[PDB]
Amino acid sequence: MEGRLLLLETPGNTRMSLAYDEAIYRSFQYGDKPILRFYRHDRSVIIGYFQVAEEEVDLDYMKKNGIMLARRYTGGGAVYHDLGDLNFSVVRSSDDMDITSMFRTMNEAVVNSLRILGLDARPGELNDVSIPVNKKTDIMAGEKKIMGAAGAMRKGAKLWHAAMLVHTDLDMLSAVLKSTRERVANVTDFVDVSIDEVRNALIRGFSETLHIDFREDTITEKEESLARELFDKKYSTEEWNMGLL
Ligand SMILES: [Mg+2]
Numbered sequence: 001m002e003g004r005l006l007l008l009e010t011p012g013n014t015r016m017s018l019a020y021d022e023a024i025y026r027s028f029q030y031g032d033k034p035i036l037r038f039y040r041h042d043r044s045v046i047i048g049y050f051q052v053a054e055e056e057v058d059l060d061y062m063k064k065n066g067i068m069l070a071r072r073y074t075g076g077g078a079v080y081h082d083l084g085d086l087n088f089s090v091v092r093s094s095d096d097m098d099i100t101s102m103f104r105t106m107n108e109a110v111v112n113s114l115r116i117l118g119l120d121a122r123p124g125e126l127n128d129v130s131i132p133v134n135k136k137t138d139i140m141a142g143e144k145k146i147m148g149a150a151g152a153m154r155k156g157a158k159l160w161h162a163a164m165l166v167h168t169d170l171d172m173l174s175a176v177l178k179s180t181r182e183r184v185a186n187v188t189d190f191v192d193v194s195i196d197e198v199r200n201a202l203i204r205g206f207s208e209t210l211h212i213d214f215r216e217d218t219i220t221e222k223e224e225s226l227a228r229e230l231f232d233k234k235y236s237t238e239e240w241n242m243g244l245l
Helices: 014-027 059-064 099-116 170-176 195-210 221-235 238-242
Strands: 002-006 035-039 044-047 068-071 079-081 085-094 139-141 144-154 156-165 213-217
Touching: 014 035, 014 044, 014 068, 014 085, 014 156, 014 221, 035 195, 059 068, 059 170, 068 238, 079 170, 085 195, 099 139, 099 144, 099 156, 099 195, 195 213, 221 238
Parallel strands: 002 035, 002 213, 044 068
Antiparallel strands: 035 085, 044 079, 085 156, 139 144, 144 156
């Protein structure tokens, strides 16, 4: 019931930030304390494991706008991130490989968190990794998407991470990702709250819903070392971020 709250970031370096996520996930052993990490990325596009940068984005556009390209460990589509997005990941012990159940539980936690702030949200309804919005992995505010998520599972553990639009440049978001703009929204379009307020609400929602007492802690030397190794050998390389490795 005791958990770890990691306010671990690497703003400026999205590839390293993603390395941290895989690091805490891979280093995790069944029975360890659950982990909830909050972080943010500066202007960048993150593509899913099974995607190739040149099919989903305009490398020319992003290069001209100084938008970092990064590829994550988890599957799913491409998303745009900026400092207006609040990202968070959860790592816990797992007894099965039920993907649908993991997303359903996390979304329940998210809905409860947003309810605290007076924002009524709900999970998307379709099982189609290819569509932009309304997926069961998305969180909607009416007909607008305000949060997306992805995950991975292995024997003994599971990773779930999301990116919620708090005050992100929705235009830029639509323009970098190859109507659409009319299908997404920021939490601040509904409630005037800061990133920390959203963070604290999520801490409460997850703690209450999962029944975990997430207490502020720090990354271990073991996890940090693994993250640096993953960055050095993979996340920092071009073959990886392009989808060739
Ligand atoms: Mg999603």
